[PDB]
């Protein structure tokens, strides 16, 4: 976990080595000071807050003895961007003059430009011509001046009292640290990556990734071949296996050496790349184990024809080559997390265990069958029962070969395989004490490993089907509720269809939760992108600043309306401007069509001007699958009143397509025709309606 | 579950035994009264509220007959801290004089000091010289005085009327209870631990813990050896087993005895340590069972050579030694909770059941094989089939020994093992009716136990992988959302990287939930520790009291910002002071660097002075992995206005590094150079811009 980060301050403070620095801007008139340091504030007496936003020429610290020639030099060097180091008397808060040495070194940028200046400071007050302005005593002023040069008097020039005429080297010693700032100028105020130290290969590189698989394949091959070779009485009539063994040893030794020069993930951190402790970590962790596993003890003895005693006993222990599984033990944490890879690992270890146990079974049978000097055939042993069953039984003149190795290995593997899988055909079965003990052990191991496999498979299935079961349960609950509360089909069908359709599109994701997971800036940018369709299109938003745009994108809400669904029923309070972005809607007023809205149109009421709620005067109905972007009145009013400059143009530029509060008046053709027909066929006691007419006239007046 | 608690009040009220006491302070002038009692208030007529904060010399209760000599005695004893008991006439609310006896006994402290006084009270009005001030009648006053001495007239001195001249012992009887207060003075007002009663060993001690494992090992050994010994016709040719059996019996009897003197966890409480019922609990729970299991019935009969009839029948029942599993039945609740220990327990019980069933199988075979007086060999039995298969078949001259016990036991164990593991090689198989019935039983038991093992393994795997599956599901949901809503890669990469990185560091812990779980004081202290980095460092907080410090630590929030993430975009409302504690940030104004912030710097606006919101005038961008401590404006204003004294120094001491509301003005070198170049190359109808200039001048005026 590493990101491209600007390492300006860290590198500069590490490389300063008990010095002081002030950063200045390079592209502004008079070069305002952009940063100061604790050492600078301590030496000058000026606080960082009161020294910020000051000219980098340090004119704020000038006085009587400052030289116009020095002013010219600093100005010309600043305007020329050249490395230089001056010494000029400077003035602190109390105006008391003290000698001073300076050095200026601007730093470039990755885009081939100069952005930041850097002026360093040094004190030579105790090692220059003594100058005083107003002090109680000359020696007192000298002591005061000397008390400020602790950095110079320290280990930087601690050998000065022990020697004489050291001024010829004190300046060089002081400037040596300052000249190192070019090393910290290498990032050049840019997103410099964490470059690795030389002769170290990152462990997430392509080469390392493709090497790990080869090392795993080779360790698998050696784990398979070692017990077979050690137990099945195989001969060395085939030389090429020795050559392949030698190449295997070479590859493993090369990997062992390469494990020194490779970064590793630190348990107490994230990434460690320090060669002074990487090698120590590897050596203390696994180097001894891998080296002892990676040496062919018998190879040298066989090549040199050593004595058949202690040397042969040492050589015969090549079973120790099996512990090469340290590589797999290391690697298994890379892919142990996957649900579906643990099953493959378990199947592979099942097969490997089957091979090992079959090899042990042959070893037991071969140790058992003969009776050594007793010359008894021991017809009890399975290795004789199989020789009788399969054909070519034993005979003597020396004893015959009986079964061949090719069939013997397959038979042993079949027996171990049936024992592990717990099928148990039993045509080959243990018969003596040692075989029976081994049988008890093998049944126990097989039962446990089978339990592990079954557990893993059940976990995979359950974690696969949990989500579908949850969805089905929710649907069943909704159906049961709707059946219980006697809701008719005309609404039940719509509810079930809406639930099914919304699940089909939204899948198992919650937009609110996804938004809340991310931080604030990510939330802002995601919302701005989601409402880009309205923002870029509608002309009323073309004069929006970043802050108001984000504050509006936070509140804008997207609503999907299916055809047939009403949005604003007649008489409902209207409190939300809504921009149509897709599909089309219509407005119905007194069971008639009075306007039709399409893409890029907004309908509602002018909230910031009306400042009151009104009843909706017409119904709005969906026609096609539309997308709406509604915004509540309160949030819009708050944002608009916060951004007065934005409002002064928003009010002028936003014109509503249809205003819901206002309603139109009109007459019907059928109504006027009926009125004319009635008039074609055309009160003294009408006191109540006379009073009604008088009241209506008074109200209209 | 016991904690170090001060048992002052509980012990003193238990030991008072129907008396009264008033606690007084020992390190304050005039010794204000720190606590009173119901008995004291009832007898004196003064309420606790109106008697608190009064001199411990009881001068508030003095009157005419109080003696200056008694005042001198009480003062000198109080200043000398000495045990003493006086009697002096005291005055109640109605001023009526009544005789009184007092005793003062200060109590020390664990730090070798005196902190609390203790003055006891007693009434001797009815047993002293009668004194009256103003009463209706002498006998009436006598009755009134006698009516107040019920505590003395009770069982404390109930034998006084039955005897004469009892005043010589009444004082001793009254003082005996008061003198016991030294026992309650033992805690000395300190965190006294709940010391155990003598001759009782706590059951969570090291000795008990290390003894439990030994008793479990020995019960396992006896459970393994008992059925083998009882069934396999083993002989006593090896004496040492009898000695080991004797030592086993001694150890178990010692454990049985030791179970009397050991505290046990009470089901209806937490810890019970009362010896008068601990022994009863053990006896009613398991003592009879353990004692009957822990006696070698046959040992005494064998040693004494008892008759081979009823005594031998009694002795032959040593199978009853098997019920020693009561210890494991008790103990299994200690380690039943662990998920990974139930598997080991199940494997052990599997092995033990296998051994038991193999022993039963041998018993059945040996009972079956021979036909008793019929002399029939019964070639059907497995114990003859095995003797034919393995070699050395039976022969007669008496009948031959056939197979040896060493092979017979292994064969029986192998048969039971295959039956239980459900492998079923079948080279040894039941052949008669009894064997077939036992086979049906053994298959059923094996199937059920195998089911239990598989269930346990599946539960372990699922509970191991649930968390990883949940994390993967959440990541997949976020990826699916981002794919659905067409967000570009430039934002998708950042979102996915943020989620992965935040999970990597935070693991599966929610800071808000962890905070909410704990109580209020723990929450406050945890928050104070979490913000210690700012609190101890920033000088503006060096004058903070406990209440304001906690009220600020409750609202301070920690924010981790990755490099490249913006915090305050230009034009956004600024409402939060934020202290930088690690890394470094920069402020960008008009695409330029104007200030740089490091460790121990704060940027925002002076809320308590401005009392209004302002638009941010510059962008702030992260450079390195930084930690921010932001605080909202409302909470800070509320706390500051609550703590006026704290505010009067906070405003003076807090100086902002960069003020976002304030914005600096400047010119660019390129801009001024271009302006000069344009000027080097250098209106009557300009009425609109003349009007613009006039309006600008009017606005500036």
From Swiss-Prot, chains A, B:
Main location: membrane
Interaction with cyclic nucleotide-binding pocket, as annotated region: 658-660
Function description: Pore-forming (alpha) subunit of a voltage-gated delayed rectifier potassium channel that mediates outward-rectifying potassium currents which, on depolarization, reaches a steady-state level and do not inactivate. The activation kinetics depend on the prepulse potential and external divalent cation concentration. With negative prepulses, the current activation is delayed and slowed down several fold, whereas more positive prepulses speed up activation. The time course of activation is biphasic with a fast and a slowly activating current component.
Domain PAC: 84-136
Portion held of the full protein: 10 to 722 of 962
Domain notes: The segment S4 is probably the voltage-sensor and is characterized by a series of positively charged amino acids at every third position. Conformational changes of voltage-sensor are driven by an electric field generated by a potassium gradient across the membrane. The C-terminal region interacts with the cyclic nucleotide-binding domain and contributes to regulate channel gating.
Record field: intramembrane: 408-429
GO biological process: one example: potassium ion transport
Gene name for this UniProt entry: Kcnh1
Places the protein is found: Cell membrane; Nucleus inner membrane; Cell projection, Dendrite; Cell projection, Axon
Region of interest: Calmodulin-binding: 632-701
Stretches of the chain found on the membrane's Extracellular side: 233-239, 301-309, 364-407, 430-436
Highest taxon, organism lineage: Eukaryota
Catalytic reaction annotation: K(+)(in) = K(+)(out)
Segments passing through the bilayer: 212-232, 240-260, 282-300, 310-332, 342-363, 437-457
Species this protein is from: Rattus norvegicus (Rat)
Similarity annotation: Belongs to the potassium channel family. H (Eag) (TC 1.A.1.20) subfamily. Kv10.1/KCNH1 sub-subfamily.
Descriptive protein name: Voltage-gated delayed rectifier potassium channel KCNH1
Glycosylation sites: 379, 397
Post-translational modification: Channel activity is regulated via tyrosine phosphorylation/dephosphorylation by SRC and PTPN6.
Ranges in the topological domain labelled Cytoplasmic: 1-211, 261-281, 333-341
Assembly and interaction partners: Homomultimer. The potassium channel is composed of a homo- or heterotetrameric complex of pore-forming alpha subunits that can associate with modulating beta subunits. Heteromultimer with KCNH5/EAG2. Interacts with ALG10B. Interacts with RABEP1. Interacts (via C-terminus) with CTTN. Interacts (via cytoplasmic region) with Ca(2+)-bound calmodulin.
Expression sites (tissue/organ): Detected in cerebellum, at parallel fiber synapses on Purkinje cell spines. Detected in hippocampus neurons (at protein level). Detected in brain, but not in the other tissues tested; expression is highest in granular cells of the dentate gyrus, in hippocampus CA3 pyramidal cells, and in cerebellar granule cells. Detected in pituitary.
Region described as Required for phosphatidylinositol bisphosphate binding: spans on this chain: 142-153
Chain positions of motif Selectivity filter: 422-427
Topology in the lipid bilayer: Multi-pass membrane protein
Domain PAS: 5-85
GO molecular function, one term: protein kinase binding
């Amino acid at each position: 976990l590493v990101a491209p980060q600007n390492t300006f301050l860290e590198n500069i403070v590490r490389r300063s080595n008990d010095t002081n620095f002030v950063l200045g801007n390079a592209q502004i008139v008079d070069w305002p000071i952009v940063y100061s340091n604790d050492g600078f504030c301590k030496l000058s007496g000026y606080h960082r807050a009161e020294v910020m936003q000051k000219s980098s020429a340090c004119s704020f610290m000038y006085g009587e003895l400052t030289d116009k020639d020095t002013v010219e030099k600093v100005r010309q060097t600043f305007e020329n961007y050249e490395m230089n180091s001056f010494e000029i008397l400077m003035y602190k808060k109390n105006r008391t003059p003290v000698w001073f040495f300076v050095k200026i070194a601007p730093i470039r940028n990755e885009q081939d430009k100069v952005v930041l200046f850097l002026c360093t400071f040094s004190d030579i007050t105790a090692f220059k011509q003594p100058i005083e302005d107003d002090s109680c005593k000359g020696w007192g002023k000298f002591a005061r001046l000397t008390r400020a040069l602790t950095s110079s008097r320290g280990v930087l020039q601690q050998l000065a009292p022990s020697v004489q005429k050291g001024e010829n080297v004190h300046k060089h010693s002081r400037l040596a640290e300052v000249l190192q700032l070019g090393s910290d100028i290498l990032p050049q105020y840019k997103q410099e990556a964490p470059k690795t130290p030389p002769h170290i290969i990152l462990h997430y590189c392509v080469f390392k990734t493709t090497w790990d698989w080869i090392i795993l394949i080779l360790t698998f091959y050696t784990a398979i071949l070692v017990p077979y070779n050690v137990s099945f009485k195989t001969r060395q009539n085939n030389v090429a296996w020795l050559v392949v063994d030698s190449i295997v040893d070479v590859i493993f030794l090369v990997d062992i050496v390469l494990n020194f020069h490779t970064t590793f993930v630190g348990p107490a951190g994230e990434v460690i790349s320090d060669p002074k402790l990487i090698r120590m970590n590897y050596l203390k962790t696994w180097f001894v184990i891998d080296l002892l596993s990676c040496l062919p003890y018998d190879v040298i003895n066989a090549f040199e024809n050593v004595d058949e005693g202690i040397s042969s006993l040492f050589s015969s222990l090549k079973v120790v080559r099996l512990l090469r599984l340290g590589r797999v033990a290391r690697k298994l944490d890379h892919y142990i997390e996957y649900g579906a890879a643990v099953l493959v690992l378990l199947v592979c270890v099942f097969g490997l265990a089957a091979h090992w146990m079959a090899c042990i079974w042959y070893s037991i049978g071969d140790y058992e069958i003969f009776d050594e000097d007793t010359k008894t055939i021991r017809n009890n042993s399975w290795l004789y029962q199989l020789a009788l069953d399969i054909g070519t039984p034993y005979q003597f003149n020396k004893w015959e070969g009986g079964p061949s190795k090719n069939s013997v290995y397959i038979s042993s593997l079949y027996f171990t395989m049936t024992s592990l899988t717990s099928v148990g055909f039993g045509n080959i079965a243990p018969s003596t004490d040692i075989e029976k003990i081994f049988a008890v052990a093998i049944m126990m191991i097989g039962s446990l490993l089978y339990a592990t496999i079954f557990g893993n498979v059940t976990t995979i299935f359950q974690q696969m089907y949990a989500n579908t079961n949850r969805y089905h349960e929710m649907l069943n609950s909704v159906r049961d509720f709707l059946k219980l509360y006697q809701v008719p089909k005309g609404l039940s069908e719509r509810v079930m269809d809406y639930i099914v359709s919304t699940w089909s599109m939204s899948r198992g994701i919650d937009t609110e939760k996804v938004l809340q997971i991310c931080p604030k800036d990510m939330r802002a940018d995601i919302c701005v992108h989601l409402n880009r369709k309205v923002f870029k299109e509608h002309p009323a938003f073309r004069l929006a600043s970043d802050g108001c745009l984000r504050a509006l994108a936070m509140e804008f809400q997207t609503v999907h309306c299916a055809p047939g669904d009403l949005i604003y029923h007649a008489g409902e309070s209207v409190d939300s401007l809504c921009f149509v972005v897709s599909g089309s809607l219509e407005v119905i007023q007194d069971d008639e069509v009075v306007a039709i809205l399409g893409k890029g149109d907004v309908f509602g009421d002018v909230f910031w001007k009306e400042a009151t709620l009104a009843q909706s005067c017409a119904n709005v109905r969906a026609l096609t699958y539309c997308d709406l972007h509604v915004i509540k009145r309160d949030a819009l009013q708050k944002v608009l009143e916060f951004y007065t400059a934005f409002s002064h143009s928003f009010s002028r530029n936003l014109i509503l397509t249809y205003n819901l509060r206002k309603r139109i008046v009109f007459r019907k053709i059928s109504d006027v025709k009926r009125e004319e027909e009635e008039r074609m066929k055309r009160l003294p006691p009408d006191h109540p309606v006379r009073r009604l007419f008088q009241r209506f006239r008074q109200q209209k007046e």
